[PDB]
């Protein structure tokens, strides 16, 4: 076949980020996953000769029993070159929008051999029987900024048939998810989703069941600048947030009520709020905000991975 040359931004080296400790449950799940990815060729074992590292952990999506590997490529993404498909203002106007995970599609495209070293990561060892189990990718990895950009031409022709027969439908890709929206009746909308998934399945693409959304009831953007989200605790499970680019010019405000449940706390509820706000920012503007979270760094960093349910990770800072 053939790959796409890729580069880090000028003057920048690959990531050297320590692996953080994990629960035995997550370690066991990463070992099962990575064992299989290795046999399939998607990743290769490596040793300490590779000086780069990126943290890994494991998560379960909302209403799902399947562990999913999540590599926190945020540092590699900052350092990866920019790549040179505008945002659909119509998406936020649709009666219904379904979110499909298509991250499995990347694993069919090889990664430039000279870039692979930068994607190394380390599964910690249970009971310290080894110093760790290390791998690097041979294919486009989920969560890397480069993967949807390189795959895009492939994605366009995967979707050309379906779009040709359904122009009343909007399909927007952000990172590793498709956003599929229509004003159709929900029954009509839900079966068009199946139709799309059948088609993607014919291409090998399997898709975890998607989250549904209805933005038409959600109630001066400069796309060259970052979005910022601030969150405040209100008490009794309630939260407020503002999204803005210049401090006094708010573009959106809202409030978030914590998920019902016997087990809850501020960290879990914050991860819920971040995920709901990020999802809305993507549908409205196509960008994930940088979050200002009302919580101590150490507390967040100790616990947030116990509650994360998304395949992406935003930037955040603390107080």
Author numbering: 5 to 88, 94 to 218, 231 to 240, 318 to 417
Sentences from the paper on this structure:
Formation of active HIV-1 reverse transcriptase (RT) proceeds via a structural maturation process that involves subdomain rearrangements and formation of an asymmetric p66/p66′ homodimer. The viral RNA codes for a p66 protein that forms an asymmetric homodimer in which the RNase H domain in one subunit becomes destabilized, leading to subsequent unfolding and proteolysis in order to form the active p66/p51 heterodimer. We utilized the isolated polymerase domain, p51, rather than p66, since the initial subdomain rearrangements are largely limited to this domain. Two different fingers/palm/connection (FPC) subdomain constructs containing the same interfaces that are present in the monomers and in the p51 subunit of the RT heterodimer were investigated using both NMR spectroscopy and X-ray crystallography.
In addition, we relied on our previous strategy of deleting a disordered palm subdomain C-terminal segment (Lys219—Met230, referred to as the palm loop or PL) in order to block the metamorphic transition to p51* and, consequently, dimer formation. The globular fingers, palm, and connection subdomains of FPC1 overlay well with those of both the p51 subunit of RT and the p51 monomer.
